[PDB]
Amino acid sequence: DADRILAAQAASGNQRAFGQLVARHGVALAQAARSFGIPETDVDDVVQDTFVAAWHALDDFDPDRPFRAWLFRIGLNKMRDLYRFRRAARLELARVASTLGKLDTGSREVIVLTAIVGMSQPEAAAVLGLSVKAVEGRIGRARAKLSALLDADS
């Protein structure tokens, strides 16, 4: 696991190792933010705030633990504060966010984590503080809701 080695180095004070974690995970954090409809005026800020908090909290992180799930727990909490207030192409991006925005919050978060950033069901469950079975249930609900929405919009 490349991330485990990088995280251990970052926790020991290596800002260059931390920079590599930012390079590896920053796109996926911003993707999630955009999926949640956070304004472009705020996406870069949230992503920055998430990594700055992660850096300062590395002292309380066991580097053997999965880094992405820990990082996304920080990130999602910061995103939740903002996305309630979500407002060329990208008319395409607005369409994606507005469709996902019609999902109830629980199924929106699970589908963004799994289908958009690419987390496994157990990884998403770890981020969300849910059982893996709860995640599997929410995914089913989300897919059913999306199918209807897409049927009605075509």
Binding site: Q31, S35, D44, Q48, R90, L93, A115, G118, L150
Partner: peptide, 29 residues
């Protein structure tokens, strides 16, 4: 609807929009 195909599209759209992440300004902190 083909939910899988749409999610693939959503993933691509959000990613292409998010390529310009600024590692430097994060390091500036």
């Amino acid at each position: 609807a083909d939910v899988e195909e749409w999610l693939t599209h959503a993933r691509k759209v959000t990613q292409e929009a998010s390529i310009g992440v600024d590692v430097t300004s994060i390091q500036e902190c």
